Every structure is written in C-alpha cells, then in structure tokens.
RNA sequence: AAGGUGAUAUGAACCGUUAUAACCGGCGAUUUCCGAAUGGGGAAACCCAGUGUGUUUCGACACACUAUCAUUAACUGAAUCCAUAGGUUAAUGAGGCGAACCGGGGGAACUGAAACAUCUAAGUACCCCGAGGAAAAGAAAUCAACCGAGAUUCCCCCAGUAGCGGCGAGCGAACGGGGAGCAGCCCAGAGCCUGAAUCAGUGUGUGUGUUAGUGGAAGCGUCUGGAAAGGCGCGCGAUACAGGGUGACAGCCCCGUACACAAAAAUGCACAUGCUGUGAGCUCGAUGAGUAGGGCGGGACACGUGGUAUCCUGUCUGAAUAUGGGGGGACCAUCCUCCAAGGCUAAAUACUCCUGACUGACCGAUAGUGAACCAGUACCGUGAGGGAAAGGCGAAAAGAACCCCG
RNA sequence: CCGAACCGACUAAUGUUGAAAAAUUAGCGGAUGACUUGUGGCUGGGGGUGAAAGGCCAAUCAAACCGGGAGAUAGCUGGUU
RNA sequence: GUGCUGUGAGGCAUGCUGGAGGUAUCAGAAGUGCGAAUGCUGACAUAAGUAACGAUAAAGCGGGUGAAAAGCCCGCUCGCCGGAAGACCAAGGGUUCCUGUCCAACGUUAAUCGGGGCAGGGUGAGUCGACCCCUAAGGCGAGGCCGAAAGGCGUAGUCGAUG
C-alpha cells in the first residue's frame, strides 16, 4: 500500500474544483520514495519506503531512533 | 398433588348421571377421570377379523371432567372437598368438611 | 428447438454449489442471507 | 483382529424373500442385512465367529431406500447394505 | 441397577458388557424372524449397556 | 409422585403405586459426519495419508498426534569473516457466527431548485474495517467580558433568532439560562519516607437474588334445560372478586390468586475477611519539535473565500520553548484568559437477536407476521432471488353395529 | 466438382386461441474446410464478445438480471364510498 | 320474511332460521359508509354442450376375463419402420424396473389396462466404471510483489479430463 513507513502518511480523498465550482473525487497520494538507508550501529542498509517528509524526519530524529519507533509498532523492515 | 385418586369413591357433580356414586378406575392426565358405571355410552363397534369379531353396539364408560365428580364422604353422607396437610412427615389428604383425613 | 436449460452437474457444482459460495466473501453473504430468511436448502449442492 | 465388540455390530437381520431362499439352496449363500459401513472382511468375521461357519466369500450391495406418502407427507426409507455370504461346502446354516 | 454395577472392577464391568452386547444380538436376530414376543426387552439391554459405559467412564476419571 | 413408556396414533410388549416408575431442576457423562474446519485434497456431509504408541490368531486392529498466521524462546544456519536472512521445534494467542446500537475508512443518484451546472438530496443509501455491553467523549493552550464560570455526555430553552445562501431553493448556530448525572487522575524523575492509598485477580465467609418447588379460605336447596355456573330462596370466605377451566354466565366444583414458606447443587450481586500484584506521602526538579506558525491544493466548522477568525492535512517549509507560548471571528495595540504538540477515567446516553411478567378505546383468517395450519414450505428461477393458498363436527367420538339398492 | 450423414435457412403452402412462444411439408445452399461436433475452461454490464446486424450476453438488450436508495418524480390520465 | 314508522341517511316490532352472546342513555375515539380506478382476491356466468381430442402407418374377426371390452390378455389375418420407429452406452433423470392388487383423481374417450394409487420384491465385481497414479486449458496458491479497506497478481506447490 502507498504508505510511509516513519510517518503513516497515505492517501486521502478531496475534490477537484473547477471554476464553475463542480466538484469531482480525487485523491492526494504521499511522495513516497523507496530509499536504502545506512545504519551505522548494524553495518548495513536498511531499505524503506518512505514519504520525502518522513526522510526529513529521519533526518532529524536519526535512523535508531526512527527504526525503534517501527519495532514499538510491529512495523517489519 | 391431585385431589381425586385411582380407587376413591367419588359422587358425581354435574351433568346427566348427577347424584350417582362409583369408584375411580382411571385417571387420565387431560384432567378426566373414568368412574365406574357413570358416563355410558353406546359404541357401535366394527368388527374386527384381524382377532375376535364381536362387533355390535357395546355399552362403556366415557370420561368426565375431574371438577365434574366430589370425593364422597361417607361419615356424612356427602360430596366434600379435599384438603392437603403435613402428619408424621407424610403429605395426607383431608376431609374440609369435619378434618379429618381421608 | 435447443433450449437454454442444459443440465450438468459437475457445471451445476462448480458454478453455484457450497464450495464455490465458500470461496468469496460475496459468496458467503449469499449463505448469510439464506440461512437469515431460514431456507431449507441452502444451495444446489445435492 | 477385529474386535468382538465391533463384530457384534454389523449383522443386522436376515434377509427373507424368494431370491434369498433360492440362493441358500442352491448355491449355499445365506442373505443377510448388514450395517451400512460394513465391509468385506467385517461380514465374514462376524458371520463365522457368530454364526460358527465357514464362509467362502462375501458380496455386497447397497440399496436405496425408497420414497414414500404417508397421507400427503412425504418421505424416504434409508438406504441399507445387503450381502451374499457364501459358505463353504459342507456348512449349514 | 447403577449401585450394584458400581461394586465391580473395572474387569467385571468389561466381562458384563460383552455379555450384554452378545444378549443385544441374539435379541436382535429373534427379533428380525419374528420369533421374540417381548419386544420390551430390547431397550431394556440397550440402557443397560449404556449403564455400563457410564460407570466404565466414571472409574477411568472421565 | 400414583401413575407412566413425547406428537401423529390406536395397538403391542411392559414399568410403577411409599419410593432408583415417570415427570421437574442443579451438576456430570456420552456427543457420528459436514461446516472457521485446522493432516493433504474436494463437486459440503466425501476421497487419500504421515508419524508415534500399543495390540495381533500375521489377515490386521485400536488410540493419539500432524493447518495457517502472530508473538516469545531454544536449537540450527547462506551468499560472507563475524553476523544477518533462512530452517526446525516448543509455549501462548488469533480466525468463524450474530438483529440493532457504536467508532473509523470510502461514498451515490433519483429528487428539490417548478429547466439546470453552484447549491440540494446528504455525509443519507450502500460497501469496508474494528470494538463493547454499551461505544465514543472527557479533566481547558475552554468560554466569558474587566463581572465571572470551571472536564465529558444527555434533555428543555435560547430560536427558525444571529448568520450562511445562483442572498435562489434551501441550510441554520452560539453566548447565556433551566435540568439528568457528577470524579478525578497518571507518565515524560530523582531523593526521602517507605510498602502506607488504590484498583485487579484468587480463596473464604454473611446476606441477597436466579435456576425445581410447599400450604393456600368459603354452597346448598329449588325452577328452566341435553347439560346450570343462569332464575328464585337462604347461607358463607375475602390481605384471596387477578386470570383460566368445567355440558349456558361460578368469590365458595377445579387450577390458581392474596398471603406465608422452601434448596442437595450451580450461579449473579453487595458486604466482610484473607492471599497476590499494585504502589501512598513529603521534597526538589522537569513540563511532549519536523511540532505551533507559514506558502500551495482540498476538507471540516450553521459559515458556499467571502473582509473570514478557528480546526484537519496531501505537498513544500518551519519557531519560541515560561524572561515563553495559544485564544478572545480580518488585523494591530492594550487587557483578560488559558498552557498544544503524552495518556487513563464511572454515571447521566444508544439499542434488543434473546428470557420472564404484565398491559392495550391494537388485529380477529382477503385482517393481524409472508406464515394462527409441518411456511420461508409447495411452487417459480441456471442463479442471486421470488414466493403462496390453506383455521372452526360435537359437551363428550357417543365418528353411524346391523339391514337394503349398487 | 456431383451427392447422403452432418451444418445451414433461399422460395412456397400450411399453421397463426399452433402439434410448435419460430415449426411442418415440398423444393433449396455448404458438405476436406475461414468445416462441423462432445466435454471442460476464460471474458461481466458503459462492461464483455462481435467476418459489424446495435448483433449476441439464459424465450430479456441503443446498456442484462436480482436486491436496495424507493412510497424517485409525475404542472399528466383515472378514481375518490 | 312480514307489518308499522320518519323529510332523508334510517328506526321499531315480529314469524322462521340460528344456538351464545348483545347492549340503552349521555359522552369519547375512528382502519366509519363503494358501482366504477383496463382497481385487488375468491366464487360463478357467457360464448356452448360449440372448437377440439396432437402427424392420413390401418385395421378385421374369434376366444378369455369382467358389472361393463373398438382400446386389456390370447390367437389368426392385415398394415407400418427396418443407417430405424431395431439394439446398446455416456449425459440427464431417480424407482419410472418386476410381481400382486385397486380404478376415486391422473390418462384429452372407455378402461378390466398404465410410466397412475397401494404393498412386496429387485441392482452381488481383484479384471467393467468411479476412486486411484499422471498431467492440459484453467483454478487456487505458503512466503512474495501490489493495492484506501474489500482485494489484484503470482513463486514453491496443489488441484483440474475432455487425454
Ligand atoms: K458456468
Ligand atoms: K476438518
Ligand atoms: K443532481
Ligand atoms: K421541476
Ligand atoms: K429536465
Ligand atoms: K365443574
Ligand atoms: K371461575
Ligand atoms: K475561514
Ligand atoms: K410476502
Ligand atoms: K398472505
Ligand atoms: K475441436
Ligand atoms: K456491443
Ligand atoms: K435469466
Ligand atoms: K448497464
Ligand atoms: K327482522
Ligand atoms: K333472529
Ligand atoms: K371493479
Ligand atoms: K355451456
Ligand atoms: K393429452
Ligand atoms: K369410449
Ligand atoms: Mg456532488
Ligand atoms: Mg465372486
Ligand atoms: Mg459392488
Ligand atoms: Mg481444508
Ligand atoms: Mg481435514
Ligand atoms: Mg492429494
Ligand atoms: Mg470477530
Ligand atoms: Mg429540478
Ligand atoms: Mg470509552
Ligand atoms: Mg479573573
Ligand atoms: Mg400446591
Ligand atoms: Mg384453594
Ligand atoms: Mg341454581
Ligand atoms: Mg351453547
Ligand atoms: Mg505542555
Ligand atoms: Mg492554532
Ligand atoms: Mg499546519
Ligand atoms: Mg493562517
Ligand atoms: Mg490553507
Ligand atoms: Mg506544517
Ligand atoms: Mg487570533
Ligand atoms: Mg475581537
Ligand atoms: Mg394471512
Ligand atoms: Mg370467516
Ligand atoms: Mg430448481
Ligand atoms: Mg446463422
Ligand atoms: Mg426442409
Ligand atoms: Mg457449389
Ligand atoms: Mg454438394
Ligand atoms: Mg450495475
Ligand atoms: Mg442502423
Ligand atoms: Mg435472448
Ligand atoms: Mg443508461
Ligand atoms: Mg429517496
Ligand atoms: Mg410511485
Ligand atoms: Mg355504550
Ligand atoms: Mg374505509
Ligand atoms: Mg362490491
Ligand atoms: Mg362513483
Ligand atoms: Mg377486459
Ligand atoms: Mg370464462
Ligand atoms: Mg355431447
Ligand atoms: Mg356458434
Ligand atoms: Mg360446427
Ligand atoms: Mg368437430
Ligand atoms: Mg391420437
Ligand atoms: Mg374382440
Ligand atoms: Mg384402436
Ligand atoms: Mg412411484
Ligand atoms: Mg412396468
Ligand atoms: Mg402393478
Ligand atoms: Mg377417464
Ligand atoms: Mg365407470
Ligand atoms: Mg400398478
Ligand atoms: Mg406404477
Ligand atoms: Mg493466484
Ligand atoms: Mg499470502
Ligand atoms: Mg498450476
Ligand atoms: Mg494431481
Ligand atoms: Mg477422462
């Protein structure tokens, strides 16, 4: 599923509006890319899928922290 | 427990044979009672060759309706009412009428 | 004339019989609304 | 060993009828109505402990109970197992 | 008839049953020929094999 | 308990009458096969196994294990040196079903606007996921207005008001007031003092229900009649004249009713008292960041972008952190008020597949359930699905022996 | 190529509350092929499939059937004891 | 049914039938009044004792049984099919099979007859078939990859005959 792994970002539903103001369904999806991330406590990489916010995220909270978040939430990587 | 017993001498209430007194041969579970020589009727029987064949219109006894029939008192002579009381432990039955058990 | 009722009951099993309800969760809502109404026979299955 | 208990279990009845009669004397094959999940080997086992024969070999079929009315009710006989026993030559039963 | 079953052993109670399935059988086959008059005692050794499967569960511990 | 072996449904063979007949209740035992179906498979109720214990008269037989996934543990174990992935086993849990109510993820159109696209219908119908006996919500970054209030939920007002609105059709608050109910706490952390409050579990008591039951008052004569409970006459009970039955309408014939009692066993509740875990208090600290806020696109707020506060966030960004920050309906100043980015929490509220009791200016066989009756049946359809008609002899079968035409 | 089985359906009569909700009878075309047929499988509704007729998709097709929104709406017709 | 009665909707009395309920007055509440809606359900008419009795292969007679025989049974003759209108399987059906008995309804007539009613009987496998071993198209599918959820695809596998 499009779902970010760090920050459980996925789609949601809105509308399209025209200027005549007609309303259509349409989705927002994530900006979601899958990236291998080097984990310097285990001598490896460790490959998420991951939304470009939550790479900020991981950016500033590092990848432990972040990875033991996923172990609390069962999350598998 | 019943108030009318298989073998009780009982005088009937109501209906065509009233005031006649017989003995309780039968209860039946529908709340009717077969008394003897009470409720007659005349059966006009087939005949049957599968054993004996006396068919021909046979005289028996119909059931009644329990509340139909008094336990006789003989002491007094009359129709009584029944009543339920505890003596040496056992569950009797007793006579309204002068108390004293059945 | 050929008419449109050809019977054959390896078909008649395998289109609608108890397994093939069992296999979808729209199939086992058919069984749920049978059994709800109290049908005496819930499906083809002889 | 099949155990007695389950030997006492699987004869039923004998089976009477003009077949049946024809069939003892003149090829030795007693008739008889067997449980429905009896086989071969359970017949014979049970027919020469209980019946005390010799039996050669056993047949058998299944028969298809049929439907019937009981005043505008509807219903079905069961279904029920017949077996041919036939006994070695010598035997009576 | 419970009580008295219940004073055997294990090994009487097996010895009864199988005389009371032996019994069950040739009841069974007198019945089939018409040759058995009191049908009554056809369930009577009907409960009471089922009397003797209670008690042998009873002194299993089941 | 003096009767009994359910109905159709007679009969047969029997059981029982002073207590192992039957019947009623508690606790047990047994409980084929299919079905989540779980040893593999499968056209449901069938086909075919493996392993281990036993047993055997050498033909064979009995019993027990053997699904998948999640978590945990042990042993093992690649590329690859450590490792990791992977593999095997064990323990524990889950799955399926169910009428409504509840929270969440998605989400129409007919229709109305006398056309129709914004708008409406409507976050309705419907699909999906998940829970509980209720759920959700909940202990102010809330309102108010310089006076004050003090978590959430529900009811009556405020008010069809203020507003929103092709300012059309329509949509529609809050503040404040009256009620039901009422309850507050914890982590983001050390020290002291200690095991102290408090909840949960498990034993044990005492009550109090629930699941069988016991006793339960008092009427005769006469008339009509097939039959009296009716008429007429004279009596009696009532903490009982609720109700039902009995050959017509019965307080006193029967079953009940008021009232008074009852439990070997299992169980609910409220206390009590053990046992287990839980920590109580004081002091000193600490005070939730990719967050608040912003740009862009949408959504939610009665509020349709409007002068539009506030809330949510798909996308791009991004503080201060108590000497600080949020809100007071554009915005600024002043003042007031509150403390987000962690969490728990009873009651008042919603519903009824199901059980008991009672009630109705509700129906009485074309009505009332589709179904008073063997109805979700017969029948129709490949299937999803659709779906009837059909009640009444008599008080009692006394259901018409026998004769006559055929 | 001629012609039975087999697959079709050009003409006529009959039939039209039929023997039959598409047939019968006499004739007719193909008949080693882009043939015909059995069994089983696959494609699903704005979708399928179509040597293309809007043909066919269970006697239903310019959007199948069943259930639901549902008592859609009906400035129209009928009826109103 | 009859008589009486009021301006009307109606009212009252009474014979017969019926065989256990009914209800003044004054108030109260409505599923409160039917001839129409090609209304709905049931019953019963009309046409009418009319059309028709389902291939124009076809019957005749003697005997039997029987309440009754054009139709059943037996016999002789005649006619019709014979690449079928004969024989035998698969599919589909499910007792229709055989014997006895019955003739209400069913059978487009009668029926003694029947695929009709009722009762009893009848289906015997190491070699035929299924199950079974093996696979096709195709299905499902541990992990897996993908997707708001439901789900989609598919690897190892496991099913699946029409072989
Ligand atoms: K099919
Ligand atoms: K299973
Ligand atoms: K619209
Ligand atoms: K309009
Ligand atoms: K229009
Ligand atoms: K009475
Ligand atoms: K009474
Ligand atoms: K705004
Ligand atoms: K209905
Ligand atoms: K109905
Ligand atoms: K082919
Ligand atoms: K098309
Ligand atoms: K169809
Ligand atoms: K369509
Ligand atoms: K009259
Ligand atoms: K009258
Ligand atoms: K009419
Ligand atoms: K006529
Ligand atoms: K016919
Ligand atoms: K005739
Ligand atoms: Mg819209
Ligand atoms: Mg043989
Ligand atoms: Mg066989
Ligand atoms: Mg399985
Ligand atoms: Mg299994
Ligand atoms: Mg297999
Ligand atoms: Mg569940
Ligand atoms: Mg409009
Ligand atoms: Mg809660
Ligand atoms: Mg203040
Ligand atoms: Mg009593
Ligand atoms: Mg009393
Ligand atoms: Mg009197
Ligand atoms: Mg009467
Ligand atoms: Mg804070
Ligand atoms: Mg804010
Ligand atoms: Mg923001
Ligand atoms: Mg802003
Ligand atoms: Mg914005
Ligand atoms: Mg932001
Ligand atoms: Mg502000
Ligand atoms: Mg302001
Ligand atoms: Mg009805
Ligand atoms: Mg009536
Ligand atoms: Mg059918
Ligand atoms: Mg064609
Ligand atoms: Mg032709
Ligand atoms: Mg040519
Ligand atoms: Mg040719
Ligand atoms: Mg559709
Ligand atoms: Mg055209
Ligand atoms: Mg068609
Ligand atoms: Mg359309
Ligand atoms: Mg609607
Ligand atoms: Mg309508
Ligand atoms: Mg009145
Ligand atoms: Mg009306
Ligand atoms: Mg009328
Ligand atoms: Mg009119
Ligand atoms: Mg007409
Ligand atoms: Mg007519
Ligand atoms: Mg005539
Ligand atoms: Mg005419
Ligand atoms: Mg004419
Ligand atoms: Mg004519
Ligand atoms: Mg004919
Ligand atoms: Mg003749
Ligand atoms: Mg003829
Ligand atoms: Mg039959
Ligand atoms: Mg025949
Ligand atoms: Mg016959
Ligand atoms: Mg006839
Ligand atoms: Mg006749
Ligand atoms: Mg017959
Ligand atoms: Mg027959
Ligand atoms: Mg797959
Ligand atoms: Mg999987
Ligand atoms: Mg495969
Ligand atoms: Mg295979
Ligand atoms: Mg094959």
Same mark, same amino acid.
């Given at each position: 599923? %499009? ?13 399209? @509006? ?35 916010? *939550? ?15 996923? !172990?609390?939430?069962?999350? $598998?990587? | 427990?019943?108030?009318? @017993? %298989? ?15 017989? &003995? ?7 709340? &009717?009672?077969?008394?003897? #020589? ?21 005289? &028996? ?21 029944? #009543? ?19 | ?15 609608? *019989? ?14 749920? @609304? ?6 005496? @026979? ?5 | ?23 003892? =004397? ?49 219903? %079905?006989?069961?279904?029920?197992? $017949? ?11 | $008839?419970?009580? =008295?079953? !219940? ?26 020929? #018409? ?28």
């Amino acid at each position: 599923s %499009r779902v970010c792994q760090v920050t459980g970002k996925r789609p949601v539903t809105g509308n399209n @509006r025209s200027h005549a103001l007609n309303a259509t369904k349409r989705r927002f999806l994530p900006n979601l890319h899958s990236h291998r991330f080097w984990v310097e406590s285990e001598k490896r990489f460790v490959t998420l899928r991951v939304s470009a916010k *939550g790479m900020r995220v991981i950016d500033k909270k590092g990848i432990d922290t972040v990875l033991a978040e996923l !172990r609390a939430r069962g999350e $598998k990587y | 427990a019943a108030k009318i @017993r %298989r073998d009780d001498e009982v005088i009937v209430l109501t209906g065509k044979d009233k005031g006649k007194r017989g &003995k309780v041969k039968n209860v039946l579970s529908s709340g &009717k009672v077969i008394v003897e #020589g009470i409720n007659l009727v005349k059966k006009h029987q087939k005949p049957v060759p599968a054993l004996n064949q006396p068919g021909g219109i046979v005289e &028996k006894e119909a059931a009644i309706q329990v509340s139909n029939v008094a336990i006789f008192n003989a002491a007094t002579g009359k129709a009584d009412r029944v #009543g339920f009381r505890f003596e040496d432990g056992k569950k009797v039955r007793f006579f309204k009428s002068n108390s004293e058990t059945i | 004339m050929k008419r449109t009722f050809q019977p054959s009951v390896l078909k008649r099993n395998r289109s609608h *019989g108890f397994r093939a309800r069992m296999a979808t969760k729209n199939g086992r809502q058919v069984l749920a @609304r049978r059994r709800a109404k109290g049908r005496a @026979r819930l499906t083809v299955s002889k | 060993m099949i155990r007695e208990e389950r030997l006492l279990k699987v004869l039923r009845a004998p089976h009477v009828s003009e077949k049946a009669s024809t069939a003892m =004397e003149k090829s030795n094959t007693i008739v008889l109505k067997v449980a429905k999940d009896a086989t071969k080997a359970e017949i014979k086992a049970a027919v020469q402990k209980l019946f005390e024969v010799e039996v050669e070999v056993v047949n058998t079929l299944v028969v298809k109970g049929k439907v019937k009315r009981h005043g505008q009710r509807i219903g %079905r006989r069961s279904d029920w197992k $017949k077996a041919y026993v036939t006994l070695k030559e010598g035997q009576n039963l | $008839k419970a009580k =008295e079953l !219940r004073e055997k052993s294990v090994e009487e109670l097996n010895t009864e049953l199988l005389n009371l399935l032996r019994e069950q059988f040739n009841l069974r086959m007198q019945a089939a020929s #018409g040759q058995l008059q009191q049908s009554h005692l056809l369930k009577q050794v009907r409960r009471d094999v089922a009397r003797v499967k209670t008690l042998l569960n009873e002194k299993a511990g089941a």
